[PDB]
Amino acid sequence: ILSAASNVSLQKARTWDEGVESKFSTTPVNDIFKDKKVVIFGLPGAYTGVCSSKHVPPYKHNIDKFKAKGVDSVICVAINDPYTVNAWAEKIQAKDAIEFYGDFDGSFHKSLELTTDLSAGLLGIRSERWSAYVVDGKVKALNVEESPSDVKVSGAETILGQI
Amino acid sequence: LSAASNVSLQKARTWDEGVESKFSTTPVNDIFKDKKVVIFGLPGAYTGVCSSKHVPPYKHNIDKFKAKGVDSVICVAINDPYTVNAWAEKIQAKDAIEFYGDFDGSFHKSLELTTDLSAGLLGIRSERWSAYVVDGKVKALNVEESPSDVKVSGAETILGQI
Numbered sequence: 183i184l185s186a187a188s189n190v191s192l193q194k195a196r197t198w199d200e201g202v203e204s205k206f207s208t209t210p211v212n213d214i215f216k217d218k219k220v221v222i223f224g225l226p227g228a229y230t231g232v233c234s235s236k237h238v239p240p241y242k243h244n245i246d247k248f249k250a251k252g253v254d255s256v257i258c259v260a261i262n263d264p265y266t267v268n269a270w271a272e273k274i275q276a277k278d279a280i281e282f283y284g285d286f287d288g289s290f291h292k293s294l295e296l297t298t299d300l301s302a303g304l305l306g307i308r309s310e311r312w313s314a315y316v317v318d319g320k321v322k323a324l325n326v327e328e329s330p331s332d333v334k335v336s337g338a339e340t341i342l343g344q345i
Numbered sequence: 346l347s348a349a350s351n352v353s354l355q356k357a358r359t360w361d362e363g364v365e366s367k368f369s370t371t372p373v374n375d376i377f378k379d380k381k382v383v384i385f386g387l388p389g390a391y392t393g394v395c396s397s398k399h400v401p402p403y404k405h406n407i408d409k410f411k412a413k414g415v416d417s418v419i420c421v422a423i424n425d426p427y428t429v430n431a432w433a434e435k436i437q438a439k440d441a442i443e444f445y446g447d448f449d450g451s452f453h454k455s456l457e458l459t460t461d462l463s464a465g466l467l468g469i470r471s472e473r474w475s476a477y478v479v480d481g482k483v484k485a486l487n488v489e490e491s492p493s494d495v496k497v498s499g500a501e502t503i504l505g506q507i
Binding site: 198202206208227228229230231262263264265266268269270273284286287301302303304305306 | 360364368370389390391392393424426427428430431432435446448449463464465466467468
């Protein structure tokens with residue numbers, strides 16, 4: 183726990199991905215942010231509110247503009263097991279354009295203090311809706327929606343204008 | 346205090362739906378009270394051999410169940426209700442089987458049916474089980490030895506126990 187803001191995300195956590203493929207390997211956060219320009223956005227979770235409606239698409243549609251700015255990878259993370267994140271990623275044909283990761287522990291977001299209680303909505307403790315541009319592990323730009331159901335500042339359009 | 350042949354009736358509640366705003370939840374009484382219920386739980390939506398060998402058999406024998414007087418056949422899992430639904434739709438299992446969620450895990454925790462599946466990248470989930478409950482009392486209980494096995498919680502078995 184330590185409010186993300188413009189610091190070094192590098193905390194010994196790790197995230198997931200796949201589609202029920204047996205080995206269960208996971209990706210250390212270093213392999214994701216070290217020596218790379220990363221655009222990453224998180225959301226309440228697969229199959230929820232306005233995630234798979236207004237949040238994800240914009241990133242897929244501007245995948246080129248991102249790479250044009252030198253972005254190494256554009257990733258979507260969510261506190262969902264990697265198998266559901268994938269089912270969902272397939273459903274909205276967002277894979278191949280955006281790298282989807284899971285954070286079933288919620289440990290990734292917990293280390294950045296980006297978890298919020300969405301038990302009223304019938305989802306457990308989840309992540310807030312955010313986006314950030316991280317260079318070699320350092321947060322150059324951070325956007326956290328005031329309300330997880332809003333897509334006012336974590337959209338692709340915004341972060342893009344910040345790189 | 347694991348489940349065995351007792352009264353499931355514990356003040357918990359389960360879910361369902363498909364991102365429809367009201368967020369109502371179903372009290373366990375409304376589910377088991379005065380009814381013959383066949384219920385089976387599994388590790389979770391989009392996992393191992395759940396949506397492959399476990400669910401189908403129940404859908405395919407939905408008639409035989411009702412023939413025996415079963416009021417409802419339900420599938421429960423520690424997944425939010427929106428994912429359970431996405432999954433239920435995907436495997437065209439709805440309309441045949443009532444799918445519920447247990448995001449709290451509270452339902453299974455009260456029956457001591459939770460197991461740690463962190464190695465498989467799923468959090469704390471439920472074991473793979475099936476049970477026939479009459480007016481809240483467990484007349485038959487089947488808990489797989491290993492959550493990945495479908496040896497005793499299948500539809501075929503529970504059916505032969507009603």
